[model samples]
Target: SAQRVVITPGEPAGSGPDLVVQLAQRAWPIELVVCADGALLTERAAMLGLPLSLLPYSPDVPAAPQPAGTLTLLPVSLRAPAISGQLTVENGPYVVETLARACDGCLNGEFAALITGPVHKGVINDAGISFTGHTEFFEERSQAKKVVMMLATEELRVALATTHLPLRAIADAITPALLHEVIAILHHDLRTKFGIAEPRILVCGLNPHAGEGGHMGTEEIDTIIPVLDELRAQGMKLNGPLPADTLFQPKYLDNADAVLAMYHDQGLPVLKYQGFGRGVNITLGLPFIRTSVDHGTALELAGRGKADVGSFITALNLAIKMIVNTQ
Candidate 1:
């Protein structure tokens, strides 16, 4: 059977469409299905002054390999016309619909992997959709009790225990139960999807200097340390509730398969600074493989032919790699 990969161009006003269009200008080994409105893509392709050809997708047949300047589309119509560099709440449902279709196909084994483009969380919520971000959206839809959000580059990988939460909300969020569930997922997937056996995970503490020996916070002592010890006893090579500050250094990262940060900002800022243009956001523990661009909707760069496609290109490369590895 020929394998196909699904791509969803999220938030029509964002650079997602541009990124996909740019990518289609080159050939790929597997079939790439863009789960989007055909009209939206045609308009965007013209806007970018790029030539594109669209073929309506058929799942019954083995997907044929796509050549440069061609797209295979599973059409999900848009609700409204998208304006370049401007967000309209009306187009939010269109974004969500594209994601739903892509996810469904991936879960059902119709696609080998999913490569996602950026989506606007605020606009989706503004449209009366209770949207957080891609990580949570797929988590609920797939009905997975626990999932891990990890970002990666060739050099490093960092997974978040808590994502897109307020700083005040993060402390309560980092409990022993949560850490155990998150780390188990991270460890399992690193072994299964990433092919890292006996993964050495470097964990970040919830406080400055890892609670400064309990002066700053007790999550490391009370919850983190105890949970990691239990896992280690179970034969997991877990390291740290180490200070988030020091753990990112080469001394620690060189030996680690992944870093588990207590919250989002604690880990991502450093990773993004290091690999902003080429990083890939991978959702681990899903029934199927899923990866996304590390950056968000660059609305200002949407249609100007100025948006860098490095992350999107790297995301496709990683998705194809994971698909082959997992198979």
Candidate 2:
């Protein structure tokens, strides 16, 4: 089976460069094409006091053993210099350029999957770029109409109906139609991409105690219940509008294939509490497999060689697993 994977090192001013350099040290299975400013990687390696011997780029590079002490580079030229521990508008477009290259490679059948490092959204947007997050960017590049952002670990997977929204806006965003779409994506993804024959789905409500039987809120009754019913009618194993409070117990998570979180905080807090360092953010409906470290850029710890590699390793392993499963 042929599989190509692109590793995009975004936000050179942060831990992204460090993580990319460290992760690249491990022997991988797919043809690794790294799209970023090669100088940033070399500079970061020097800061960490590590010798970097970069493997020259050749279009014919196979998914096999490389020459000794080799790191493949698919260069994305950056105009401004990357300054560590600071955010500058000068380098904002460079991060986007790296992302664009990876996205295009994945779309052209040159890559089977794309694994991305973290990007500082505030910095990128502060430079006058209208950006939300990587999930949105990937969706736009792949032309996916509706993409769901999911966080998964080895034990449990949580998909949010509404992400990066305030509590006040959570109700309006989580409508019946949106629930249907998110769950449909989840169902198809878990079965086809994840190879789970029966992907049981457990959903949540918008309010306390899942709207306390409609006392706390009516959105669950108006939206969640109906959607769950329709999903159930389709011969899919669906559960909940369950009380958001007690639904995240290990016993509950142990019984289901994946849990459908009502919003970000409703499920993320528990998942992060249990699996923070090992969590991986997986974009569910992208044209290509994309998995990222659930953690962010640890700037203060960069180059000290103190960053925990758990999440980075988890992301790499999950990306590799998806590559194998997708074939």
Candidate 3:
């Protein structure tokens, strides 16, 4: 491999570290660096009775493949020693620091890509940090002007026009400008990053029954159709303003390359239902490749070795594939 990939086991006490230990059970073709506290991982490995030898990360050394049962550690300190299945506000900065360091590594070319584990947003906020999510954190820290949220499984890809917003706010949030940028980013990444020559996108309307021909709502007739028309004129393959309910049907989805949802819950429920724990959350239009697990901490399963490594494994594999695609 030409470069190393960085993984941040997000919440110290959560199953993030355990998943990392499980992941280390298999050898990888690229160096896998973990940007977290060494003691936390070592402790978790001991509790799980897993053998983990940490190789301290140094840019001074050349990139190398990761050996099974070992990890390259770019150590960060913990504010409080984490207890499995525990939440501590005092350790919020520790979580943030690991993310910042990993972001820095990717930005400067020290890391090929970033694969993040689950983060406890409520705990991070409870600690007085105004953290939102991994996507927004990396976007602002990396200074990316705009980033699109995309969730994907093997069979389907869904990108959101608006993420993390109130139901009432969603109507005003999906503006023409936002739609244009989101669509453009999704299209560009599908072509350049995913290698789709002519991507066909099926877009869902903002209103039920697609505004019922302007009776239920006019957002489709007013905002959505115009943008689709404009992009379609540019020779891009785009479809709908279709009714949100019927767009996921195979007749439409089987031939489409991706689906653009108006907001978070609008399209994700179907994607999540179809590919729950196996899907990965991806950030489109970032300077470097970023992929994350679609699931949460599952704190109860931390040290018991009961947590499934499904999405975490999928996230890492997707990041590695994206690194290959981009680099």
Candidate 4:
């Protein structure tokens, strides 16, 4: 009755590996498959003083609940040596390779869902890979036509209309088609992925005072308002062009299933504020389920036994929960 879920502990030199080793300290219901080097995890497990035994994945065996201290290893190798807390350009492609393997397995229906560890976007790009965040990477690779990036705490969930774009590029990026797809994906995943039958979304404004009645910005009048109107007519529970400042309050958010922010910076700050290490980043609209740690690779915390696995655990548990909901 259990599913096998894959985990790609991002950034070998960062806390990704450290956190994964810590995760093995506890028993879990689903088989936990990790798509990274076996040696790397063993090395980090030593540093953290945790027991880790890598079980090579067998095709003949179906998913089984994992006993404490063991992980099902997919066995992707590192291109170069990875030192703790150091950023090596040589291993950047290695990081991407782990992600590709896990994602591909999910696409092939080998794994039920993907639980990604924190990845370093800048380092991947520094190694000459045109890396956006995980959201875009999965979208482009899986070839999903449209996707939504949502971050969730225990009480609140925030979805972004646009992600990982420059601040100056914000206004021009908002369009009717973009808003429609983003909202539709967010609404659908809330039901299919999270089991919210009728998802009520609270949308944020691009400018101050909900665009100050078109004074501060015309994006609200020209773009957002119309999209909301047309989507509302089609019978989706939507509310906003609301002031983001007050939207975070219980007076509004209590009724909303999720908040649709105009941009990355607009939404994440509030979500992080509410639940920093406890949040999970969910990529909506993928063919398979995907969830990730809300935090980034804490390179300095690598191998120190100081990395907190709260977000990692949250991501893993959420992936399992999403799998159950969809199934």
Q: Whole-model lDDT for model 2 versus the true structure?
A: 0.82
| 168-230 per-residue lDDT for model 4 (tens digits) | 998889988999899999999999988999899999999977898988988999999999999
Candidate 4 accuracy as lDDT: 0.91
Q: Once model 1 is optimally superposed onto the true structure by TM-score, how far is the C-alpha of residue 224 displaced, in angstroms?
A: 0.5
RMSD of each: 1.1, 1.6, 1.0, 1.0
lDDT of 3 by residue, 23-72 (tens): 99889889999999999999999999999999999789898889999999
Model 1 ranges with Cα > 4 A deviation: none
Question: lDDT at 291 for candidate 2?
Answer: 89
Model 2 quality (TM-score): 0.95
Displacement of residue 8 (Cα, Å) in model 1 is 0.5
Tens-digit lDDT track for model 1 on 254-296?
9999999999899998898888568899999888899999888
lDDT string, candidate 2, 262-323, tens digits: 88988898888878579999998888899888877776776677777778778878888987
Weakest 10 consecutive residues of candidate 4 by summed lDDT: 57-66
Assess the local accuracy of residue 284 in candidate 2 as a C-alpha lDDT between 0 and 100: 85
TM-score, cand. 1 vs. native? 0.97
Q: Residue 175 in model 2: shift from native, Å?
A: 1.5
Model 3 steric clash total: 0
- In candidate 1, the residue pairs with backbone N, CA or C atoms under 3 Å apart (3 or more residues apart, or in different chains) clash, namely none
Greater-TM-score candidate between 2 and 3? 3
Model 1: lDDT of residue 109: 89
